[PDB]
Amino acid sequence: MIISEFDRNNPVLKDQLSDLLRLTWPEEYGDSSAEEVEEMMNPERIAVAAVDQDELVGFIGAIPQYGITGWELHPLVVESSRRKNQIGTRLVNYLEKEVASRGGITIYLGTDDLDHGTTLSQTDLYEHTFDKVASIQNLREHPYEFYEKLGYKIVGVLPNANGWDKPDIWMAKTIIPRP
């Protein structure tokens, strides 16, 4: 398709990105939505987009959080009408190569469960924490499974992150061969 570095100076593409972020996570992106997008344009971050002739259909970003070795994959979104078509896979694949060329070793992410999309939510995660993580099941097509299919593994959970029994699920992947 046309997956490449995002034009950080295109106010329109950024407006499109802003809308997509509002439509996908209205609880996190609101009026000041434009502010969140500008944060994603910061020079240290990677910003990549899937654009179709002029329409933004997907976006993925990465934040270097530990020197340049540890990067946080944030955010990742594909327009609803174009999902399940490998756009997300391509975006991730593209990101991993770029992160690796910058010196990255590990890409991690936090995928929240606010909608009881997995069995990790609606339960006291301090009781048998890791048995619950190991027996995780997908209840509402939660995206954690999307990442697992791409080689990411659940390496942690933040109990009650977004309110009681609405945890964040930490996943990670080492993107280069161990020398």
Ligand X SMILES: CC(C)(COP(=O)(O)OP(=O)(O)OC[C@H]1O[C@@H](n2cnc3c(N)ncnc32)[C@H](O)[C@@H]1OP(=O)(O)O)[C@@H](O)C(=O)NCCC(=O)NCCS
Q: Residues forming the annotated binding site for CoA?
A: 76, 78, 83-86, 88-89, 110, 141, 145, 149
Q: Does 37 bind ligand X (CB under 6 A)?
A: no
Question: Measured from the CB atom, is 79 or 113 closer to a second copy?
Answer: 113
Q: Is 10 in the site for ligand X (CB under 6 A)?
A: no
Enumerate residues 79-108 that contact a second copy by CB under 8 A.
105-106, 108
Query: What letter does residue 169 receive in the DSSP assignment?
Result: E
Rounded CA-CA distance 178/99 in Å is 16
Q: Cα angle vertex 35, ends 34, 36, to 5°?
A: 95
State the nearest-atom distance from the C-beta of 177 to a second copy, in Å.
Answer: 11
What is residue 123's DSSP assignment? Answer: S
Q: Which of 95, 93, 98, 90 is nearest to 57 (CA)?
A: 90
What's the rounded Cα separation, in Å, for the pair 171 and 157? 9
Q: Which of residues 104-143 bind a second copy (CB under 8 A)?
A: 105-106, 108, 112, 124-126, 129-130, 133-134
Kindly indicate which of the ranges 4-12, 33-41, 94-102, 137-145 contains the residues binding ligand X, using the contact rule CB under 6 A.
Answer: 137-145
Dihedral angle over CA of 98, 102, 106, 108, nearest 10: -60
**Binding site residues, a second copy, CB under 8 A:** 65-67, 69-70, 105-106, 108, 112, 124-126, 129-130, 133-134, 153, 155-164, 166, 168, 170, 172, 174, 178-179
